[PDB]
Amino acid sequence: MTVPTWQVRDLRRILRVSELSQHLRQARTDFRSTLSQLVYFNRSVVNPNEYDDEYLLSDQRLTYVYVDEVTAQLCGLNRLLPSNSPAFGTVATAMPPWLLDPQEMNAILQQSCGQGGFVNYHHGPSTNGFFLAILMSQLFIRIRTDVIRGQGYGWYARQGNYVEEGETREFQLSDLIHYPIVALGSCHLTR
Numbered sequence: 001m002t003v004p005t006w007q008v009r010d011l012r013r014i015l016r017v018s019e020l021s022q023h024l025r026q027a028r029t030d031f032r033s034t035l036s037q038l039v040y041f042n043r044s045v046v047n048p049n050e051y052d053d054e055y056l057l058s059d060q061r062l063t064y065v066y067v068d069e070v071t072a073q074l075c076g077l078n079r080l081l082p083s084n085s086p087a088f089g090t091v092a093t094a095m096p097p098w099l100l101d102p103q104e105m106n107a108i109l110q111q112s113c114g115q116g117g118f119v120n121y122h123h124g125p126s127t128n129g130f131f132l133a134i135l136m137s138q139l140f141i142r143i144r145t146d147v148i149r150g151q152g153y154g155w156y157a158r159q160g161n162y163v164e165e166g167e168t169r170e171f172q173l174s175d176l177i178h179y180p181i182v183a184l185g186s187c188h189l190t191r
Contacts, residue, residue, distance in 0.1 A: 001034050001035060002035075003035065003039065003041040003079070003180045004079075005034060005035075006031060006034065006035065006180060008076045008077070008079070008181050008182070008183060008184060009023065009027040009030075009182065009183035009184075010076060010183070010184055010185075011023050011024070011027075011183050011184065011185035011186075012069075012072070012130070012184060012185055012186050014185065015186060015188065015189055015190055016189065016190050016191075017098040017189050017190065017191050020097070020098070020185060020189060021096070021098070023183070024062060024096075024133055024182075024183060024185075027062075027133070027182050027183045028058075028061070028062050028133075028135070028182060031058060031135065031180075031182050032058040032059070032135075035056075035058065035180075036058065037057070037058050037059045038055055038056070038057070038058070039055060039056035039058055039135070039180065040052075040054070040055050040056075041054070041055075041056065041178070041179070041180050042054060042171075042172060042177075042178050042179075044170055045170070046170060052169075052170040052171055052172070053169035053170045053171055054137045054138070054139055054169075054171040054172070055137055055138060056135045056136070056137050056180060057135065057136065057137070057138060058135045060135060060136070061094065062133045062134065062135065062182060062183075063092040063093060063094050063133075063134055063135075063136055063140075063154075063156060064092060064093055064094075064095065064096060064097060064131045064132070064133055064134070065081065065082070065084065065090060065091070065092045065131065065132045065134060066084075066093075066097075066105065066109060066119075066121070066127070066128035066130070066131050066187070067082065067084075067119055067127070067128065067130050067131065067132055068119070068126055068127050068128070068129060068130060069129060069130045069186075071118070071119060071130070072130035072131070072132065072184045072185075073184075075132055075176075075181060075184070076132065076181055076184035079178060079179065079180060079181060080176050080177065080178060080179060080181075081132065081134065081176070081177050081179035081181070082117065082118035082119045082175065082176055083117035083118045083119070083159075083160070083174075083175040083176075084109075084113050084117045084118065084119035084120070084121065085113040085114050085116070085117045085157070085160040085162075086114045086115065086116035086117060086160065086161075087116075087159060087160045087161040088117070088159045088160065088173045088174060088175060089113070089114075089117065089157050089158065089159050089160015089161065089162060090117075090140075090157065090158045090159070090160070090177075091109075091112055091113050091143075091155065091156065091157045091160065091162075092134060092136060092140065092155075092156045092157075092158075093112075093153060093154065093155045093156070094153040094154045094155075094156075095108075095146065095148070095153045097131050097185065097186075097187045097189060098187075098189050098191075099148060099153070100148070102125045102128055102129055102187045102188070103125045105125075105128055105187070106121055106124060106125040106127065106128050108146070109121040109127075109128055110122055112143075112144070112155060114160075117160075117175055118175040118176055128187065129186065129187050129188060130184065130185065130186050130187060131184065131185055131186075131187060132181050132183075132184050133181070133182045133183040133184070133185070134179070134180070134181060134182055135180070135182060136156055136158070137158065137179075139158045139159065139171060140156040140157065140158045141156065141157060141158075141162065141164040141165075142154050142155070142156055142164060142165045143155050143156060143157050143162045143163070143164065143165055144165060145165065159173065
């Protein structure tokens with residue numbers, strides 16, 4: 001089916017870590033089940049009836065774009081993804097919302113992302129108190145790996161002039177793009 005058939009999972013009232021993880025797992029499975037392993041989503045500006053070149057790879061785990069609650073609501077309800085770095089970059093991570101306290105996550109985000117985008121983590125932890133859970137398109141490249149409690153977590157960037165760890169396509173370049181959101185939720189979680 002097409003992306004508009006997907007109702008974003010609003011998990012903002014699921015605040016226990018174990019419950020949230022289970023809901024995220026199910027949301028990912030339901031998304032893949034209904035939309036396939038290969039998901040086009042944005043209509044071309046060149047031919048408005050066909051899709052542009054950006055596609056989601058849904059045979060992968062969810063990654064997270066951290067946001068404030070206002071941005072979470074705007075993006076979740078409207079199928080949008082914000083930039084969080086200059087040059088229209090969106091940085092996502094495999095680090096789930098319960099891995100670190102939002103204050104700690106904000107420190108890592110500040111080091112990972114510049115200023116000038118829609119979301120700007122340099123204003124402090126209120127900017128990452130919530131999250132958008134996504135499946136990444138082929139335009140996300142891995143930029144770094146962080147190791148916490150002996151486990152590796154990838155960091156990824158769509159655009160933003162990042163360099164990959166170790167252009168003729170048509171796609172959106174904006175501080176807010178049309179993009180499928182699997183789920184949204186809070187980082188203010190109880191163990």
